[PDB]
């Protein structure tokens, strides 16, 4: 049963069947590969099938540190008591640290450029090398961990490696929480849904359940509509870096070799700050680089990520569109006319009805990314309700939320409130001119860029234990 090479529908495979006149796959006997998610209770005919979350639901930088103890220890530098995370011993990005390589049986990254022979990177989460821009964000955070452990060693020379690792890890987890709820989520939800689902923090509530709901694994995939079809690299003058200033995403999936032999992470971080995201429009949902060429270089056929999202919701047994609108307290359209009004687009509504037959059967990612966007938000009301409810739970139900009394001292929180991802890029790369905050909105060079020296640095003075 190798779901990757076969189209036979035998467990654990659930391959995607091909329609007549498919734009790309002309053989209806072919299929797009698909493995059903691991069930939480194998073989039980008594339980309703449910899936597993291999990560901690908390926003704790687990993609940097790992969510299991063997892996976490292996990511650390155990050759000293400095509390550092291990770095690549063969390559460096202009003298700065790169991630360690993994030792995979069948390494996909080795397939993207066989002469270069650069394996996938190893990080706290298995998907670090999926696209080089993600690797750049993982590399940046690894460097920030080490920069902080170093500074902390100077302030407190008596601290041993464990304490140093734990204190820097605690600061990196708080930085991810602050950038996420202060800067990112307002731009996702827009101002009224933010007020509605994420009112001002009061205190940790142990009766709030912090688990990721099964639907959120599908609903947060709304970000696939933001993907541009290229990876852009800019030089120090924020000009196209030659050669390859724009390379198609189907040539960058698992391409860890571009990080090592094509310039490091700076060209890539510059490309991310000065290039706009793709706007999700009801007639421009997701690009063909991910709809037709996903993992083309390493799979027998290119995958269709929108289609994988729909198949995955069926695999996970998620209710359709109307059940989720009802859950959120939103009117549920029964007719194409009513659906036309909710979507404010009768042509889209009719196409949905032709495919699905009833709004009750629209797969949650398809219905959710089809709704008109909230004002100053990039998600419509169904997605806003699901993402907003999920993030309120992860904040209110986390005993280590950074604002929770006793997690940081009042002095440390005041220091922490000054962090920003513009500053972290300044302290760990060779980039000297960076975007003005909010970094998620800023995208035009030179209008939205400032010099790194005007950014507040994190002042670790309150971590000097006397």
């Amino acid at each position: 049963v190798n779901c990757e090479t076969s189209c036979v529908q035998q467990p654990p495979c659930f391959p995607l069947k091909i329609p007549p006149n498919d734009p790309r796959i002309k053989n209806q006997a072919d299929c797009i590969p698909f493995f059903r998610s691991c069930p939480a209770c194998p073989g039980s005919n008594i339980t309703i099938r449910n899936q597993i979350n291999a990560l901690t639901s908390f926003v704790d930088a687990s993609m940097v540190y790992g969510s299991e103890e063997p892996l976490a220890r292996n990511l650390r530098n155990m050759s000293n008591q400095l509390g550092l995370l291990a770095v690549n011993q063969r390559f460096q990005d202009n003298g700065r640290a790169l991630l360690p390589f993994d030792n995979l049986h069948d390494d996909p990254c080795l397939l993207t450029n066989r002469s270069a022979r650069i394996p996938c990177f190893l990080a706290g989460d298995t998907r670090s090398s999926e696209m080089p821009e993600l690797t750049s964000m993982h590399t940046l955070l690894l460097r920030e961990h080490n920069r902080l452990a170093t500074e902390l060693k100077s302030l407190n020379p008596r601290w041993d490696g464990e304490r140093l690792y734990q204190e820097a890890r605690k600061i990196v987890g708080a930085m991810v929480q602050i950038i996420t709820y202060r800067d990112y989520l307002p731009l996702v939800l827009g101002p009224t849904a933010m007020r509605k689902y994420l009112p001002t923090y009061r205190s940790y509530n142990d009766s709030v359940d912090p688990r990721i709901a099964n639907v959120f694994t599908n609903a947060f995939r709304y970000g696939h509509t933001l993907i541009q079809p290229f990876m852009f690299r800019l030089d120090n003058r924020y000009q196209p870096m030659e050669p390859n200033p724009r390379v198609p995403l189907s040539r960058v999936f698992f391409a860890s070799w571009r990080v090592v032999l094509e310039g490091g992470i700076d060209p890539i971080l510059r490309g991310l700050m000065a290039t706009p995201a793709k706007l999700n429009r009801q007639n421009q949902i997701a690009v063909d680089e991910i709809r037709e060429r996903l993992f083309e270089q390493v799979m027998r056929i290119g995958l269709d990520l929108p289609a994988l999202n729909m198949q995955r919701s069926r695999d996970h047994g998620l209710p359709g569109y109307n059940a989720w609108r009802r859950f959120c307290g939103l009117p549920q359209p029964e007719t194409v006319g009513q659906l036309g009004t909710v979507l404010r687009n009768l042509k889209l509504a009719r196409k949905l009805m032709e495919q699905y037959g009833t709004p009750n059967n629209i797969d949650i990612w398809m219905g959710g990314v089809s709704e008109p966007l909230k004002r100053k938000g990039r998600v419509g009301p169904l997605l806003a309700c699901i993402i907003g409810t999920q993030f309120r739970k992860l904040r209110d139900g986390d005993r280590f939320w950074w604002e929770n009394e006793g997690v940081f001292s009042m002095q440390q929180r005041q220091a922490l409130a000054q962090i920003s991802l513009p500053r972290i890029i300044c302290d760990n790369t060779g980039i000297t001119t960076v975007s003005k905050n909010n970094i998620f909105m800023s995208n035009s060079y030179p209008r939205d860029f400032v010099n790194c020296s005007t950014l507040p640095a994190l002042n670790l003075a309150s971590w000097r234990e006397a």
Binding site: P12, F14, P19, P23, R36, I48, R49, N53, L55, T56, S62, M63, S67, E68, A72, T126, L134, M137, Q166, V188, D206, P210, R211, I212, A213, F216, G223, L226, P229, M273, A274, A277, K278, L279, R281, N283, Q284, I285, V287, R291, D304, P306, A307, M310, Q311, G317, L318, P319, A323, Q355, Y356, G357, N361, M366, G397, D398, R399, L421, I439, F440
Partner: protein
Amino acid sequence: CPEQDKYRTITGMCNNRRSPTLGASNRAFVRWLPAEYEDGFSLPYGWTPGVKRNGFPVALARAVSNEIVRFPTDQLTPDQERSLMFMQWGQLLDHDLDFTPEPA
């Protein structure tokens, strides 16, 4: 769960002291609505050909992608108020929250 702890465990266990595996890794997702499967408990809609989902045939996901998601790349609208960093932080953040394992 240790009565005093200054750091998070790696696994997330003991964050909620009353129900210590909540939010911990390698645990089943919580469901906000009962699941909907072709047989009621395990089989996905679209498994058996001819079985309808609430009176309507199941649409093929690749057909829905072809007819509604597909668009000409040359017409892409750049979001003038968001950088690509907005997309990337979203993927990084998703990876701190969920990874659904599959068989090898």
